[PDB]
Design a binder for this molecule. Structure first.
Ligand SMILES: N=C(N)Nc1cccc([C@H](OP(=O)(O)[C@@H](NC(=O)OCc2ccccc2)C2CCCCC2)C(=O)O)c1
Ligand SMILES: [Zn+2]
Length: 304
């Protein structure tokens, strides 16, 4: 049984994507953009009032298996969009004017594994020749300064960058989809935990975006909206120096594809529970994160 206030396993999440789609056929369609190393379907939800050539925002969760509040949020978001459509002015405008592409869980095989075997697992669950070490890091596997810094060429490492960029069926599937929908996608948002931050490019080098001032202003105003609920303090800035150098990330890659608004979110907390954020903080985390996402969304409306 599914709950938005608890963490769901992949069976429950899969069943939910099918169920939430069938009940909101007017606001949600559902596809699979590919399969994982183990053969699981990577589901994508398109949320919005259908219409001709609508611009889109793309958000994914569950890059990293152990970061459960991530997966929890994509689900919370989807329910917020469909429950509040027509009743809350801003989301009503949002869904009429654009589409949200929500990818609930990218790294499905890893996420299963954190339920079955190792709650602290991070990487995919693909094999590597010549070793029993399992997994590539999805967020070192994109073609953005690939494996030049902040990434390991050791398969046993937590940031193993893979045998080549897009070696993972999962990262290939996501890149392929983005690359084929470049004309419509205006923002890219990728949800991780933890740290309470909003990051923008770059991490594969120490240069800043061409619209550096704009993204800085935007992040600053987003973390302000988020604080308004419970006073939760987020910080923000470029990835390389706000967290660490790390090439091959999807935010840098999407940006260099030409998506001008490209952010990595780190949700709660600051380490007191870390990846094991208790279920009793899901709702409050998700509620405050919504205000940040919606603020960014409204701004992007200015550029359609
Ligand atoms: N292009 C990017 N690198 N973008 C980016 C920006 C901010 C964070 C991140 C990601 O960080 P993350 O996985 O969410 C996560 N990092 C993490 O688990 O790192 C594990 C690790 C283990 C061994 C070596 C190096 C790193 C949080 C970072 C902030 C402190 C708390 C943990 C990432 O490492 O892919 C990526
Ligand atoms: Zn992560």
């Amino acid at each position: 049984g599914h709950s938005y206030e608890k963490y769901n396993n992949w069976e429950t999440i899969e069943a939910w994507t099918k169920q939430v789609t069938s009940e909101n056929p007017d606001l949600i369609s559902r596809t699979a953009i590919g399969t994982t190393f183990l053969g699981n379907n990577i589901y994508l939800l398109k949320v919005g009032k259908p219409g001709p050539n609508k611009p889109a925002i793309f958000m994914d969760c569950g890059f990293h298996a152990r970061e459960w509040i991530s997966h929890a949020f994509c689900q919370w978001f989807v329910r917020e969009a469909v429950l509040t459509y027509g009743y809350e002015s801003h989301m009503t405008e949002f869904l009429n004017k654009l589409d949200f592409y929500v990818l609930p869980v990218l790294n499905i095989d890893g996420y299963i594994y954190t339920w079955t075997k190792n709650r602290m697992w991070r990487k995919t669950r693909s094999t590597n020749a010549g070793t029993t070490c399992i997994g590539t890091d999805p967020n070192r596997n994109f073609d953005a300064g690939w494996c030049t810094t902040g990434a390991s060429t050791d398969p046993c490492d937590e940031t193993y960058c893979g045998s080549a960029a897009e070696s993972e069926k999962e990262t290939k599937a996501l890149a392929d989809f983005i690359r084929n929908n470049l004309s419509s996608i205006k923002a890219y948002l990728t949800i991780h935990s933890y740290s309470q931050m909003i990051l923008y490019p770059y991490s594969y080098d120490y240069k800043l975006p061409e619209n550096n001032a704009e993204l800085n202003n935007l992040a600053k105003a987003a973390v302000k909206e988020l604080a308004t609920l419970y006073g939760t303090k987020y910080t923000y800035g470029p990835g390389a120096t706000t967290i660490y150098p790390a090439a091959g990330g999807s935010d840098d890659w999407a940006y260099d594809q030409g998506i001008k608004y490209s952010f990595t979110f780190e949700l709660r907390d600051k380490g007191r529970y870390g990846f094991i954020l208790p279920e009793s903080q899901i709702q409050a985390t998700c509620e405050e994160t919504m205000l940040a996402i919606k603020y960014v969304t409204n701004y992007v409306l200015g550029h359609l």
